[PDB]
């Protein structure tokens, strides 16, 4: 019984509850340092470097573009001139931080940009917000 | 009167967002979408995203940040590295779940040392005892 | 005279061999012999054989066809999945018998939909007529 130093919990599953949050933060640090970023999103006057994998994870628009073989090897994406660079910057931060920052006078922009990017769950959270 | 909106600032914290991003990265991986490396472990291989590998492993971060090794496509680990040990760790990276079955606890731990995943190691010591 | 063994090329078809294999596969499962995966459904665990799960479920096929999960031993399903529905469908995989009762047919069906068991879903659709 005690003569046997066998590893006590035989079969076990350890659920690292914050591993997802930790991975997403480190992805954001890699973004901020321009490490293994593969696409630049040009929104009117500004530019946003990002990782296509994080973009496809969150946006139905970006998923639909980087999905056919003809388009997943693109380096520069130009959003429509109507897209607010402020509204996109708010949503891009949400993709990497799980935090959607709504300052007064930006909530309609965030909501309109989210419709553009086909992030319909964000859009619905904003609908609940106004009301 | 006025239908003005919120007269101030507010931040919406999306719980389970990071959990939902990682699951989609796992789906992209399972479909060979934008995977930028294969990890050769003895007679086994694994497609992965170098972004995910760098997030979780000190060793993969140390390699893919080096300017020379930045655009590498095939990484051969040491022939001593246990594939089943590494397989469990790569699964953990994409799921948040580290499965320590009675077979290969020490294997999973040793590979985590090799991969500079010291936080996983400190958790095996924390719960697994003798 | 030639005591030669018959004319030659021949083939025997064992009609109930498929049934006897599956029955024995269940006996192995019911005694937990060579079960190589444990399905976690809402903190309740089920042991099974990976090959039988792949043969029946389009989902478990997609899962264990993938290199990451092909040689691993634990699968956590969507936490919305009803454990009772999975247990009813796991017993179908091994016994060819589907034990749906009135009240859980909706759970059994929607769980078969998750496991990508396409033909089992259709048999439930016609079983509301």
């Amino acid at each position: 019984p005690s003569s046997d130093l066998y590893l006590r919990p035989g079969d076990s599953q350890i659920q690292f509850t914050r591993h997802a949050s930790d991975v997403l933060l480190n992805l954001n640090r890699l973004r901020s340092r321009d490490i293994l970023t593969d696409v630049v999103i040009v929104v009117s006057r500004e530019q946003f470097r990002a990782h296509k994998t994080v973009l496809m994870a969150c946006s139905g628009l970006f998923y639909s573009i980087f999905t056919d073989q003809l388009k997943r090897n693109l380096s520069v994406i130009n959003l429509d001139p109507e897209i607010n660079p402020e509204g996109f910057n708010i949503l891009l931060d949400f993709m990497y931080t799980s935090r959607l920052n709504l300052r007064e006078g930006n909530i309609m922009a965030v909501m309109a940009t989210a419709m553009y990017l086909q992030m319909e769950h964000v859009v619905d959270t904003c609908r609940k917000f106004i009301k | 009167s006025d239908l003005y909106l919120r007269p101030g600032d507010s931040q919406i914290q999306f719980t389970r967002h990071a959990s939902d991003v990682l699951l989609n990265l796992n789906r992209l991986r399972s479909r060979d979408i934008l995977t930028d490396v294969v990890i050769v472990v003895s007679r086994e291989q694994f497609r992965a995203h170098k972004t995910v590998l760098m997030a979780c492993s000190g060793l993969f971060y140390s390699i893919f940040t080096d300017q020379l090794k930045r655009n590498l496509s095939v990484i051969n680990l040491d022939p001593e590295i246990n594939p089943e040990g590494f397989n469990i760790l790569l699964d953990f990276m994409y799921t948040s779940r580290l499965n320590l079955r009675e077979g290969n606890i020490m294997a999973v731990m040793a590979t985590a040392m090799y991969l500079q995943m010291e936080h996983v190691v400190d958790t095996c010591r924390k719960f697994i005892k003798a | 005279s030639d005591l030669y063994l018959r004319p030659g090329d021949s083939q025997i078809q064992f009609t109930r061999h498929a049934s006897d294999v599956l029955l024995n596969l269940n006996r192995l499962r019911s005694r937990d012999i060579l079960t190589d995966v444990v399905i976690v459904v809402s903190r309740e665990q089920f042991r099974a054989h990976k090959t039988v799960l792949m043969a029946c479920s389009g989902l478990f096929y997609s899962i264990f066809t993938d290199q990451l999960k092909r040689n691993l031993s634990v699968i956590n399903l969507d936490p919305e999945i009803n454990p009772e529905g999975f247990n009813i469908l796991l017993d179908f995989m091994y016994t060819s018998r589907l034990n749906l009762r009135e009240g859980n047919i909706m759970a059994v069906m929607a769980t078969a939909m998750y496991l990508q068991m396409e033909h089992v879903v259709d048999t439930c659709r016609k079983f509301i007529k």
Binding site: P9, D11, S12, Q13, I14, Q15, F16, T17, R18, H19, D22, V23, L25, N26, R29, L30, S32 | M54, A55, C56, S57, G58, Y61, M93, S96, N99, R101, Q116, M117, E118, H119, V120, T123, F127 | V38, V40, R43, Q45, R47, V74
Partner: peptide, 17 residues
Amino acid sequence: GITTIKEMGRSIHEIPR
């Protein structure tokens, strides 16, 4: 069976700023 354990602590290293 499999004993499930939660771990509320940091799972991986923190890529510096």
